[PDB]
């Protein structure tokens, strides 16, 4: 039943069949509106012209209203993991980033990119250097710790709301060993990272925020890995094509390239062994 799903997946990477099947799945769920991202006021809060959030599942700021961010909820048959999948903050949407995190009650922010891959700004540094604080509107982030190996970094922070005189604790995990070109050769450092993400998620019932640069590629990989890992614990079949379909119903284009899909498929099969 699960073993049957992993023979189909294994013969599909030999077969060459799962890359073929990947190319058929839609990128945008037909008929889902994405026309806020295209409103004159909101266009410049988007990192790419062609990565917009579905109106139907976008995260709505209490301000007004817009951030490039969607709720993604992943149900496990027979546990509904909540995420907010979002782009990496731009310089001018940093206050929006922290407004979202506060209002949705997140206590964990998973960052899947470095700030400058090749010679390009992929994400704005929206948190202060350790021992530091910085202000984003009425929110003040102060950062206590920075510990991590050559593959990932854990930052312990306090996020403080000055408008509501209150402060919550907050943990950011950043995976810093993604290659500039393509996908990792060995998934073993990434897999370890995903486990950490799960230990600290725990049985908390709030969205974990997860971003890369556009918040569709690596972000889809991370959510596809954590889903696949609970499917396995519950003895449920694992069909990577269907995990992406569920994701894509909730944010367009999750898992961007064939190579990332191949990565997630080969990762899942190595995790099952």
Residue numbers in the entry: 638 to 701, 703 to 716, 719 to 913
Task: Pull text from the paper.
Protein tyrosine phosphatases (PTPs) play a critical role in regulating cellular functions by selectively dephosphorylating their substrates. The ∼280 residue PTP catalytic domain consists of an α/β structure, and biochemical and structural studies have led to a detailed understanding of the catalytic mechanism (Barford et al., 1994; Zhang, 2002). Here we report the crystal structures of 22 PTP domains, including two tandem-domain RPTP structures and a detailed structural comparison of this protein family.
This architecture is present in the subgroups NT5 (PTPH1, MEG1), NT6 (PTPD1, PTPD2), R1 (CD45), R2B (RPTPμ, RPTPκ, RPTPρ), and R4 (RPTPα, RPTPɛ). PTPs with particularly high enzymatic activity against generic substrates were RPTPσ and PTP subgroups R5, R3, NT1, NT2, NT3, NT4, and NT5. The subgroups NT1, NT2, NT3, and NT5 exhibited a pronounced preference for acidic residues N-terminal to the phosphorylation site.
